[PDB]
XYZ file of C-alpha atoms in Angstrom:
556
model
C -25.370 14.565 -30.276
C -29.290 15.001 -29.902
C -29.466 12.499 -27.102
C -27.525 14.821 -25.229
C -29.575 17.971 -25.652
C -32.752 16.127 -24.652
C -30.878 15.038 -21.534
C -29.826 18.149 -20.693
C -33.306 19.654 -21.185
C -35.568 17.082 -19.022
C -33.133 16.272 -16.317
C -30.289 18.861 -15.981
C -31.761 22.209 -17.039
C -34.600 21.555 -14.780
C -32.846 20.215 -11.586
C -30.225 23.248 -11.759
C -33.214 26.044 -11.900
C -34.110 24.116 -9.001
C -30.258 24.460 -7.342
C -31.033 28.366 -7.968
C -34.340 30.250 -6.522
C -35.389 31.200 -3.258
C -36.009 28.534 -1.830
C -34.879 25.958 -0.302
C -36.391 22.611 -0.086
C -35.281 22.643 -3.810
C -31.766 22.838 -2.628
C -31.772 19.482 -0.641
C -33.856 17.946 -3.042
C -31.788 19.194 -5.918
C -28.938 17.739 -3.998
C -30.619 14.012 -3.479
C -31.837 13.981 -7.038
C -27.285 14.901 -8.199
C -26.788 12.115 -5.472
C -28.249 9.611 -8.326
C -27.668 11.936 -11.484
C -24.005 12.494 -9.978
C -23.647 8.147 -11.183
C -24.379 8.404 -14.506
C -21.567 9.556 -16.490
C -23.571 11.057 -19.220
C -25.213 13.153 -16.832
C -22.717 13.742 -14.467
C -20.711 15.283 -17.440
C -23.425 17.519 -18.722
C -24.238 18.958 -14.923
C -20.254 19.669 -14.756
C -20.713 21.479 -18.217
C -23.159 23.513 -16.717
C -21.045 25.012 -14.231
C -22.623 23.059 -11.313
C -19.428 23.345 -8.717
C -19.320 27.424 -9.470
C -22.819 27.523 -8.345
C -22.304 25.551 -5.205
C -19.430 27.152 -4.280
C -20.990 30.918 -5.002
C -24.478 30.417 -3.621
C -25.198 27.037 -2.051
C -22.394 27.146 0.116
C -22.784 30.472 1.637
C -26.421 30.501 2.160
C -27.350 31.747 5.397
C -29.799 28.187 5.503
C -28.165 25.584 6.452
C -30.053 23.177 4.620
C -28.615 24.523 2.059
C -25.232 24.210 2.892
C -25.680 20.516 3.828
C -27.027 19.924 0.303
C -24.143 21.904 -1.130
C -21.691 19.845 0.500
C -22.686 16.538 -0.498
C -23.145 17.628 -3.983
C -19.418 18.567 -3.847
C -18.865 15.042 -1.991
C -20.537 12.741 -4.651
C -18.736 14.165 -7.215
C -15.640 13.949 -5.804
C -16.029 10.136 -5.052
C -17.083 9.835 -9.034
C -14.567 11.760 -10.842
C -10.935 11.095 -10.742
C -8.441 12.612 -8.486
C -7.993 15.508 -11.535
C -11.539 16.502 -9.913
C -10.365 17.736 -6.303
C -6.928 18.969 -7.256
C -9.740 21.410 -9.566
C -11.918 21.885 -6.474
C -8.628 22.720 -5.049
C -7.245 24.918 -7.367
C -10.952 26.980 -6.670
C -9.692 27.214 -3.208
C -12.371 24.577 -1.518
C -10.015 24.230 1.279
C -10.792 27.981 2.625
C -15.119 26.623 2.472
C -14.338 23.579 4.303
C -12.062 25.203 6.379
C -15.096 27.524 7.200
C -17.369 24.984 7.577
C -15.277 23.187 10.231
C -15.266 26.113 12.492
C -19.020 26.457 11.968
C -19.368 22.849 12.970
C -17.114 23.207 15.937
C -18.470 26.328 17.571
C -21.527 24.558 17.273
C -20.684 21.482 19.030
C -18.653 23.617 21.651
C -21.412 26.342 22.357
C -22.860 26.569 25.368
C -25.546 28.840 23.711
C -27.383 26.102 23.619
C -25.379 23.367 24.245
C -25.724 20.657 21.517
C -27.318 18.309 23.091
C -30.228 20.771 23.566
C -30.928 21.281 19.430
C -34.044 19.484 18.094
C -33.108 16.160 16.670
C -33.786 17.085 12.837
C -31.009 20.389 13.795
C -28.339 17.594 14.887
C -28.789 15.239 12.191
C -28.000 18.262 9.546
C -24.798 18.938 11.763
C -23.738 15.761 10.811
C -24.581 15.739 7.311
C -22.211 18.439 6.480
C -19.660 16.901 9.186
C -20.161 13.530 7.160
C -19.329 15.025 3.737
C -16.678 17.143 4.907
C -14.700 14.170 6.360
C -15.324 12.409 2.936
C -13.872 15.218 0.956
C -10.735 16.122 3.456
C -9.655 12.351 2.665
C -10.374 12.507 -1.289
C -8.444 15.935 -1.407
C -4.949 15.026 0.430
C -4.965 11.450 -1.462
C -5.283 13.486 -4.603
C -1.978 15.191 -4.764
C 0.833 15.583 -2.195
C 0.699 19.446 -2.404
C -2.868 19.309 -1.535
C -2.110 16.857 1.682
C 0.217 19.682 2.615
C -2.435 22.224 2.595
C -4.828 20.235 4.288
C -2.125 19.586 7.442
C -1.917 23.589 7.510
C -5.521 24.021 8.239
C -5.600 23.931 12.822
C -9.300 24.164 12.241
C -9.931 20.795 10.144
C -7.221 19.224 12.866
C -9.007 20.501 15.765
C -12.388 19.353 14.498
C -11.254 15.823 13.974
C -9.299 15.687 17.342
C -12.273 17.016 19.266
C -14.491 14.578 17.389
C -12.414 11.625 19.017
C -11.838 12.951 21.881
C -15.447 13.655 23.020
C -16.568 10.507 21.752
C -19.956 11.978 21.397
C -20.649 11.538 17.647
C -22.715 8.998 15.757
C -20.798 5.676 15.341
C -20.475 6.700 11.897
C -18.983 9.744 12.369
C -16.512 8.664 14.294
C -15.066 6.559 12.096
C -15.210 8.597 9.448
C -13.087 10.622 11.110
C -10.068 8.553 12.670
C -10.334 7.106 8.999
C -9.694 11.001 7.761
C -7.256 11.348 10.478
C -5.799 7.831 9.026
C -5.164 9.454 5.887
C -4.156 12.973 7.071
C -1.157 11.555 9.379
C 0.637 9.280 6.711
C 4.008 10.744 6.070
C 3.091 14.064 7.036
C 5.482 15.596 9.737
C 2.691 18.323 10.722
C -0.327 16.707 11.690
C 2.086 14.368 13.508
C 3.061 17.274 15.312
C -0.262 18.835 15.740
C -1.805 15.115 17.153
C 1.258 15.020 19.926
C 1.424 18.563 20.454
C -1.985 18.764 21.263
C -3.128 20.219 24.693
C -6.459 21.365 24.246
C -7.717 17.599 23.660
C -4.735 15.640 24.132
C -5.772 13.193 20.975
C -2.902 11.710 21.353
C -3.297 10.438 25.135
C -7.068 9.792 23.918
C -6.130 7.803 21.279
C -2.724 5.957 22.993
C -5.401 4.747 25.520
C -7.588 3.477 23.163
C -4.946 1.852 20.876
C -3.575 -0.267 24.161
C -6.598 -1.527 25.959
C -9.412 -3.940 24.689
C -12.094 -1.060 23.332
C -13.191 -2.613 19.924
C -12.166 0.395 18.392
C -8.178 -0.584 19.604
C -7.169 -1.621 15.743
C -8.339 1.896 14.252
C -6.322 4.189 16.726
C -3.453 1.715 16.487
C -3.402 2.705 12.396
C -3.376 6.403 13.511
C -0.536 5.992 15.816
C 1.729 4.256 13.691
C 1.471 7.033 10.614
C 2.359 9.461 13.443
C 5.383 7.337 14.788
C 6.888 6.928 11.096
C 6.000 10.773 10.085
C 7.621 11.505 13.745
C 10.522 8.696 13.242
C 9.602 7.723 16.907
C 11.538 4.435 16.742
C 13.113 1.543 17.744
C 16.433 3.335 17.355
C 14.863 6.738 18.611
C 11.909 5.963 20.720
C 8.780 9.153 21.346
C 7.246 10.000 24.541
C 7.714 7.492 27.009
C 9.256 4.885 24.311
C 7.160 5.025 22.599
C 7.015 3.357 19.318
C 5.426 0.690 16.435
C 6.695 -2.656 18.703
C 4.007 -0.848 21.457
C 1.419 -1.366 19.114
C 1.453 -5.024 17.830
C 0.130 -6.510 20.332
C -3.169 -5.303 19.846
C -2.626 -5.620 16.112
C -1.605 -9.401 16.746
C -4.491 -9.757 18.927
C -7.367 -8.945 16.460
C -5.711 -12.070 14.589
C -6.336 -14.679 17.247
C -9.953 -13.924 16.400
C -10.305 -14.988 12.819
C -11.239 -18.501 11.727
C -11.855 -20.859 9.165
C -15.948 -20.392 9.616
C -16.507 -16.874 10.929
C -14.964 -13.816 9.479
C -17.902 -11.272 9.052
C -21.758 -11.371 10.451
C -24.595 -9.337 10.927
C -24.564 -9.859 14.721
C -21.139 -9.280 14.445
C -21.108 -6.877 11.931
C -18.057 -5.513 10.266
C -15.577 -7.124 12.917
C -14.460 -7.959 9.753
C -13.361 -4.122 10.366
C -10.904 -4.954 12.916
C -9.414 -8.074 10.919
C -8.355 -6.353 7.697
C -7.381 -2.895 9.437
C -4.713 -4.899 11.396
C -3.214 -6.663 8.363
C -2.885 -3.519 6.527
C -1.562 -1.438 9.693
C 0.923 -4.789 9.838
C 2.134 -4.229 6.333
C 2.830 -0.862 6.928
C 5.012 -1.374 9.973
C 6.342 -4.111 7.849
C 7.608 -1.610 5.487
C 8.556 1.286 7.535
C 10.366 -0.585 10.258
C 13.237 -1.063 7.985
C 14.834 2.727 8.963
C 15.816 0.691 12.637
C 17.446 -2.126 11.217
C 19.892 0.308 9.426
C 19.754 2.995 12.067
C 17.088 -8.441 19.951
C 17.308 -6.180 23.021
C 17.837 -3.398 20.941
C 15.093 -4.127 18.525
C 12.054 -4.514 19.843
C 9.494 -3.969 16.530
C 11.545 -6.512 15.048
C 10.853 -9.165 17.864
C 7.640 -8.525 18.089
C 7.190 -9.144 14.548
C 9.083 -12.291 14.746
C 7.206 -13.833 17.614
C 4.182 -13.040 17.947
C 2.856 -11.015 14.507
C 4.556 -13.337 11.867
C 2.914 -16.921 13.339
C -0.430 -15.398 12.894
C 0.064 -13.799 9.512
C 1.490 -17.457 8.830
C -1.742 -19.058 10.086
C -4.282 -16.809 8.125
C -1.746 -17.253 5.102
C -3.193 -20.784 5.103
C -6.659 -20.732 5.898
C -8.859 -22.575 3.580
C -11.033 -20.719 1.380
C -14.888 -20.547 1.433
C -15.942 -17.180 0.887
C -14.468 -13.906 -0.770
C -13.466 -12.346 3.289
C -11.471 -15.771 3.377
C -9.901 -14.678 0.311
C -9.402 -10.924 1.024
C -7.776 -12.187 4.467
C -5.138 -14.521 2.851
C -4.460 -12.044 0.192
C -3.901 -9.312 3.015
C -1.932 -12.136 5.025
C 0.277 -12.466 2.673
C 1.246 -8.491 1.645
C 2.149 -8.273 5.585
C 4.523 -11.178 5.617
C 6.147 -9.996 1.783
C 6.813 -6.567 3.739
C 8.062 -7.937 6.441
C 10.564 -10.625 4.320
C 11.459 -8.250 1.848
C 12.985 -5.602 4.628
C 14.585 -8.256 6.554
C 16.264 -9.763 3.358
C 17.453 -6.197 2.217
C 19.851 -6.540 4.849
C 23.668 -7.533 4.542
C 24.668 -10.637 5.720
C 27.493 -11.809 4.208
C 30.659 -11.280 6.528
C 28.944 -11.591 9.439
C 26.825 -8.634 9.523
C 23.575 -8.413 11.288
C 24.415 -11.635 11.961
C 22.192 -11.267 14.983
C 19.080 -10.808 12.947
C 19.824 -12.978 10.592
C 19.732 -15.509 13.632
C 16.607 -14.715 14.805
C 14.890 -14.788 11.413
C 16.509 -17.758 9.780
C 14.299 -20.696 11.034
C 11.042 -18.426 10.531
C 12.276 -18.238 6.773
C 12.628 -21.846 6.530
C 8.818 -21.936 8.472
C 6.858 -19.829 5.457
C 9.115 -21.167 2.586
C 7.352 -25.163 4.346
C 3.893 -23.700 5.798
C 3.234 -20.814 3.340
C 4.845 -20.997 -0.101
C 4.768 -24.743 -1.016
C 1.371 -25.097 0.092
C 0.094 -22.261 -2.087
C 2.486 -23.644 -4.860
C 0.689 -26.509 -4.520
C -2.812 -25.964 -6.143
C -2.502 -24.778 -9.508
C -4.765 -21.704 -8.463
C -4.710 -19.546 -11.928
C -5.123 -16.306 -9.814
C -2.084 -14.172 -10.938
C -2.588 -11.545 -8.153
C -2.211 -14.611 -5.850
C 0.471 -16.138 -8.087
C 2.075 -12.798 -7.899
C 1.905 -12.071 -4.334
C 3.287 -15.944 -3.433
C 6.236 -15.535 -5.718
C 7.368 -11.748 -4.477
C 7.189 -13.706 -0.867
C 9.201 -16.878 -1.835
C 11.933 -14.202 -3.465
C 12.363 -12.960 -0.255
C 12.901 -15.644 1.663
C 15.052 -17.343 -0.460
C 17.151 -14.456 -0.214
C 17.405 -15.109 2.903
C 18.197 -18.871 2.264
C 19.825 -19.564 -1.157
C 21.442 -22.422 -1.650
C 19.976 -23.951 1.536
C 16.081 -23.488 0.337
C 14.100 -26.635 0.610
C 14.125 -28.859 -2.453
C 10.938 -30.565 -1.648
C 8.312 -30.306 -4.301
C 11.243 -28.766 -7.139
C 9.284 -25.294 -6.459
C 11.897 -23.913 -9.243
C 9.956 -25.743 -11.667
C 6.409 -24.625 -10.630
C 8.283 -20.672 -10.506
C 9.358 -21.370 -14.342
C 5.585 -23.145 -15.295
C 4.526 -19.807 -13.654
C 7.014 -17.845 -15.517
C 6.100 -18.992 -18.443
C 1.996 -19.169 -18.204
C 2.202 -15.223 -17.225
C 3.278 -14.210 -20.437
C 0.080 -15.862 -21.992
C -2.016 -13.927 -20.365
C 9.103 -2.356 -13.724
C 10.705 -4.626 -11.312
C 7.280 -4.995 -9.962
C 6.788 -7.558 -12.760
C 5.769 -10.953 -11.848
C 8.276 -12.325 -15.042
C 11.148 -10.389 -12.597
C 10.018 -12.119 -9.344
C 9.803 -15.661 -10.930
C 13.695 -15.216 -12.073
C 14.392 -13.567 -8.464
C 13.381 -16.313 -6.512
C 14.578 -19.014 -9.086
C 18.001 -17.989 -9.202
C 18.153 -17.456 -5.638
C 17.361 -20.924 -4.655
C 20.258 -22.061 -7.470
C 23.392 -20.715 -5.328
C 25.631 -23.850 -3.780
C 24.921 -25.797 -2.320
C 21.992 -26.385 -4.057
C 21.724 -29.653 -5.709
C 23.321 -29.376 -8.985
C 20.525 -30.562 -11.253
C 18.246 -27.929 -9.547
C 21.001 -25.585 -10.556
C 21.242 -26.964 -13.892
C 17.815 -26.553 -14.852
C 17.835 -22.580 -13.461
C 20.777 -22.026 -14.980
C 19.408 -22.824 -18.625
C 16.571 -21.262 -17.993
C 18.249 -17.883 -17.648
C 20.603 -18.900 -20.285
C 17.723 -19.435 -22.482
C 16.229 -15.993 -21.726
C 19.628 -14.219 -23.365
C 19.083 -16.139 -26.540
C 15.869 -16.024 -26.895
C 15.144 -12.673 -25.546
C 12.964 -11.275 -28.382
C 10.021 -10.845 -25.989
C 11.614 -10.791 -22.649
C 11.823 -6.959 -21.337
C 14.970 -5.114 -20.063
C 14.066 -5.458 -16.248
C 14.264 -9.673 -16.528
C 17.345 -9.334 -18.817
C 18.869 -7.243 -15.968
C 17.378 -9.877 -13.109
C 18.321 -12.623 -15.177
C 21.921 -11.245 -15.630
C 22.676 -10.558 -11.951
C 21.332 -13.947 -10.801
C 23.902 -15.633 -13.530
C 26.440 -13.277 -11.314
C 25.258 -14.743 -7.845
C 25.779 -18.278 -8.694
C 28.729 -18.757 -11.033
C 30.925 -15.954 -9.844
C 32.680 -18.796 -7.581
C 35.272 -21.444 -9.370
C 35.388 -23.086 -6.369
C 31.772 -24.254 -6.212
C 30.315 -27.828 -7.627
C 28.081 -25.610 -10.669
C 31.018 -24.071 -12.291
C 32.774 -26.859 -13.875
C 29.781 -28.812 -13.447
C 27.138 -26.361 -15.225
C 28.600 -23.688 -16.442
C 31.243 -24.806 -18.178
C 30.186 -28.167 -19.083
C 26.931 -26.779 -20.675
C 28.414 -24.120 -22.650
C 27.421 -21.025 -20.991
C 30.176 -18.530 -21.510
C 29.660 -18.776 -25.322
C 25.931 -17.367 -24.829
C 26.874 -14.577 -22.063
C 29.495 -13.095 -24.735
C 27.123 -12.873 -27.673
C 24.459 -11.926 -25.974
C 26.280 -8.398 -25.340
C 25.597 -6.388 -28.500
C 22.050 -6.915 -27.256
C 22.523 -5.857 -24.244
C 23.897 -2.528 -25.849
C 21.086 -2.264 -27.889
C 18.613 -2.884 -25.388
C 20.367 -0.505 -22.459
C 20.727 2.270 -24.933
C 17.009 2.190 -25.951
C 15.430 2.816 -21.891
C 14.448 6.193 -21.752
C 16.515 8.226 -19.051
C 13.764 10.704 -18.728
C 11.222 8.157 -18.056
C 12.660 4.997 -16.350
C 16.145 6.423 -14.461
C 16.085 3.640 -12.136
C 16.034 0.752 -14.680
C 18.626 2.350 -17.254
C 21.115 3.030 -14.477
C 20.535 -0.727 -13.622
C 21.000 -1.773 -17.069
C 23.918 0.113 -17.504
C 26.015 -1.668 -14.346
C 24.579 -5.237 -15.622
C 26.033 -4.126 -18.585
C 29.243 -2.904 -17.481
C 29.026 -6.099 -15.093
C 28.509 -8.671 -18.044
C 31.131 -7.365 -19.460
C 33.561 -7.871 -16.389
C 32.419 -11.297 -15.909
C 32.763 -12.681 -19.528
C 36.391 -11.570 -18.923
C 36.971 -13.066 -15.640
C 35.574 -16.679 -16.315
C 38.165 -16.278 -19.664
C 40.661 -15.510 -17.598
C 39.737 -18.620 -14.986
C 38.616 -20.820 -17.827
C 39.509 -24.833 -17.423
């Protein structure tokens, strides 16, 4: 390619002469100049090709100027945000984390010196100081998202830890700075049993008194140490069922969470005078989601459950409300779609639960009507308006699959959503149990169970019928959903549907052929590659074959 070698000679064999040499503006400036050649791929792949990160880390970086380091840094930095993740765990495997680890303590003895203190350095000396603190904070984050072994590595450096908890501590940075780095700190403390240690363990700062202040009072910032807190009480397991210091746990948190919801509105969501309060907004909805998910380790593990109430009462009615909001920007529609992943977390734990025989009986007391309240004020609405977003679509039918979990038999009727969950079914595959095709057969046959009304159950019931014959392009995970709903709902000879559907509609004759191709198709999922869904095809299997049997054995 002769495009290629002219590229490389007037931009990239130039600019990296310029990298090299004495001096020293050239570094900076080289620096800038990657900060623009760094975004095209072309040349981004050439400057890689000419061994650019081997020269930063053997000269730029350990330059006695510190000019030059700063340039070094974010030349490191902007690559890092354009490459994939394959990138750092390379930086890595060069041992990066020793040169940032170094550059930390520089940074730190130089915002803890007394010789001169800080505040006395020349304006131009500070700003550089937080250059390199800037792209440091960048490239911690990019590194321990890159590969779990490299989050490890990252928690083992007390240097990076104690510059980010003397960062928010002092409160002395740029505004920008300090978000950066509770956003690093974010990422550093998700499931990661060490720097949940190190943040509560921490004496020479006491982060974690800094920050439980913060997270519990009415500073803006109250949202961004609340997602800090919670990755430390889930890495910690300070819980409902084993509270931390002083109780503490998620349930202490959503109020402020709950809070920043009261404040968002069908008009204003983000402005320039109020700039990025949008920040707050979508921080809380994913911190909700999280403690959606994770606070399903107390239910297995309300007086008892506090996390759980407060979810209930006063987090769910606002995720409800900003479920529903009309649309008339793209923060409107971010919001709703972030509304919505917090309630599906929250539904989806609850309905894992085990109710039948009266267990957690409490709970499911205390959810029940709330179910019923999203199915009405959520779900239908949504359903209604034939919106041809599939990420919406997707995220509305993984929420009504939860709920009518919850509800079966007793889900409302109003609008026959089964039908608009089969349209959808259907209109998805014109355009592994993750799969929206899985979720529109989850919720469907959930909704079927008596006592719902037997027409309602008819027209399920053929439809999963249907999906057994006619299964040529239907994959394994909705043969195995579709299989195990059929086992909910006519398991029972005592319910209305059996004589009434399934055997006046023929449907034993369709479960027992469709068993050689259920062989076939269990036998042909990988082991190696999808464990989870052959062992599941292999009990629907064994299953299908048990229930063909029993209906035989109780036929009329």
């Amino acid at each position: 390619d002769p495009e290629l070698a002219k590229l490389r000679e007037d931009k990239i064999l130039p600019v990296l002469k310029d990298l090299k040499s004495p001096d020293a503006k050239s570094r900076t400036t080289a620096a800038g100049a990657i900060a623009n050649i760094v975004q095209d791929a072309k040349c981004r792949k050439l400057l890689l090709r000419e061994q650019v990160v081997h020269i930063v880390l053997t000269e730029t970086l350990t330059d006695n100027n510190i000019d030059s380091r700063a340039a070094g840094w974010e030349i490191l930095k902007v690559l890092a945000q354009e490459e994939e993740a394959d990138f750092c765990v390379h930086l890595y495997r060069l041992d990066v984390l020793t040169a940032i680890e170094h550059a930390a303590k520089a940074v730190l003895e130089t915002l803890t010196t007394s010789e001169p203190p800080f505040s006395k350095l020349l304006k131009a000396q500070q700003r550089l100081v937080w250059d390199i603190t800037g792209s440091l904070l960048v490239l911690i984050g990019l590194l321990a998202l890159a590969r779990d072994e490299i989050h490890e590595a990252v928690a083992t450096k007390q240097t990076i830890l104690r510059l980010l908890f003397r960062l928010i501590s002092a409160d002395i940075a740029p505004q920008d700075i300090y978000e950066e780095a509770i956003s690093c700190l974010t990422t550093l403390s998700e499931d990661n049993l060490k720097v949940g240690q190190a943040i509560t363990d921490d004496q020479e700062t006491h982060v974690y008194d800094v920050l439980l202040k913060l997270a519990t009072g009415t500073d803006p910032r109250a949202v961004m140490a609340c997602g800090v807190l919670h990755n430390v009480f889930t890495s910690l397991q300070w819980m409902d069922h084993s509270p931390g210091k002083d109780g503490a746990c998620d349930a202490i948190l959503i109020p402020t969470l709950t809070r920043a919801l009261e404040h968002v509105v069908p008009g204003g969501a983000k402005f320039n005078g109020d700039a990025r309060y949008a920040n707050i907004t979508l921080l809380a909805l994913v911190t909700l989601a999280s403690i959606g998910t994770d606070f399903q380790e107390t239910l297995v593990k309300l007086e008892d459950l506090p996390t759980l109430r407060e979810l209930i009462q006063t987090a769910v009615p606002q995720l409800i409300r900003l479920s529903n909001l009309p649309i008339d920007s793209d923060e409107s529609l971010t919001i709703q779609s972030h509304a919505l992943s917090a309630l599906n977390n929250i539904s989806w734990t609850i309905s894992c639960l085990e109710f039948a025989n009266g267990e957690n009986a409490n709970i499911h007391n205390a959810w029940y009507p709330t179910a019923k309240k999203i199915w009405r004020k959520t779900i239908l609405p949504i359903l209604e308006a034939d919106s041809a977003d599939l990420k919406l679509a997707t995220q509305v039918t993984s929420l009504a699959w939860a709920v009518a979990r919850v509800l079966h038999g007793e889900t409302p009727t109003d609008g026959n959503p089964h039908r608009k969950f089969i349209s959808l079914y259907h209109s998805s595959k014109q355009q592994p149990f993750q799969g929206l095709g899985v979720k529109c057969i989850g919720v469907v046959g959930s909704l079927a169970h008596d006592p719902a009304p037997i027409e309602v159950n008819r027209e399920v019931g053929v439809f999963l019928v249907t999906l057994l014959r006619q299964s040529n392009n239907v994959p394994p995970a909705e043969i195995v959903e579709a299989l195990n709903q059929l086992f909910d709902i006519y398991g029972d000879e005592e319910l209305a549907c059996d004589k009434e559907v399934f055997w006046k509609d023929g449907f034993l004759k369709h479960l027992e052929e469709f068993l050689p191709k259920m062989r076939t198709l269990t036998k042909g999922i990988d082991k190696r590659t999808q464990p989870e869904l052959r062992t599941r095809a292999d009990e629907a299997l064994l299953n299908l074959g048990r229930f063909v049997q029993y209906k035989k054995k109780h036929a009329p």
